[PDB]
Amino acid sequence: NVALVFSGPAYAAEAARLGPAVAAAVRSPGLDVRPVALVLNGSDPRSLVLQLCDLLSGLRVHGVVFEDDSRAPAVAPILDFLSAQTSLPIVAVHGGAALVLTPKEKGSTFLQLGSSTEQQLQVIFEVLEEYDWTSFVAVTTRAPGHRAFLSYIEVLTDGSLVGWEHRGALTLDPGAGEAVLSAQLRSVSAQIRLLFCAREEAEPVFRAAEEAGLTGSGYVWFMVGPLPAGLFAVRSAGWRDDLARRVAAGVAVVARGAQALLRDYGFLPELGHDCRAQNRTHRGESLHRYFMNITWDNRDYSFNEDGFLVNPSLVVISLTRDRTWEVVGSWEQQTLRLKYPLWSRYGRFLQPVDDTQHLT
């Protein structure tokens, strides 16, 4: 029995048809799948706190997957709030509950299909040395966890046979001034700069960068989280798997995860089936001891004890001329396949400052 919750009018009429479609998608002995579709919408946590418990009291469901259409990650802690108390494993396919939120509360079973900043950071450097892009500059602004971003940069340039070069700023204030930022933006020592900032706060800096003029093909930026030409970012194949495979993958992991404790002995967990039917919540153990080996469709989905994915499918996404995002390279178990054949230099994904200083 797997419960599905859907938010957003775009999925309202489309939530019904996926029920029986995924029922036979994955078949495992000893378990049954009963998907449900929710048409409720609204950011306010009224249906987010009443209907879910009603469904728990109604169908006695174990394992809930949530999806959202907007990019606001403001709903993840609320799901974290319920997960630790009701002892219900919650896995999110994508949407609002897609950004990693650490540290996670003790005695919680919230699992997310994404990688941390440091995990996403290290996949960039292979592209740097693949296209002979040793020079870099690290610039960022006030972020809740930006300090760890700086630490992991030097742990790869310090070693290696190739001698790397490092430079970077500390923080930038969008309200300081577009002209003021550009004057302070002149303190650079390389051609490539790294970007790590919030989504809303990313719009003002690009306009400031456009005022600075470093938004053409003569410079590149890498985004971890108006758009200059030649912009790179990592999305962990969020735009892939269509929509039908995501819910199929979401129900696949819980079906495999529920078997992890059933193999040892016959256990029927209904602890999370209620929210107001018992006044005690002390009974809970081995919440995240399991869910260490999640393998499906010739791929590994191992989750750390903290509760985040450690074997992802990282892909780098570039920009075309029509201001559309497309995937160029990919990472798959440290293989580093590169499309858009890399030949010559300063002709693909980058251009020199001037032609007259480029001679062969």
Binding site: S151, Y152, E154, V155, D158, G159
Partner: protein
């Protein structure tokens, strides 16, 4: 070990010799996780205690 006996009399302490664990001298090398580098061999055992 001929010198060590001379110090151990002048300054009046008491010793207990033991050879090194692996048999190396000492250098700094990177750990697998990040670069929390540490020492090794006879140079590292002095810092450990």
């Amino acid at each position: 070990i001929d010198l060590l006996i001379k110090l151990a009399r002048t300054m009046n302490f008491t010793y207990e010799v033991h050879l090194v664990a692996d048999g190396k001298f000492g250098t700094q090398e990177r750990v697998n996780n990040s670069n929390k580098k540490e020492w090794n061999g006879m140079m590292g055992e002095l810092l450990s205690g």
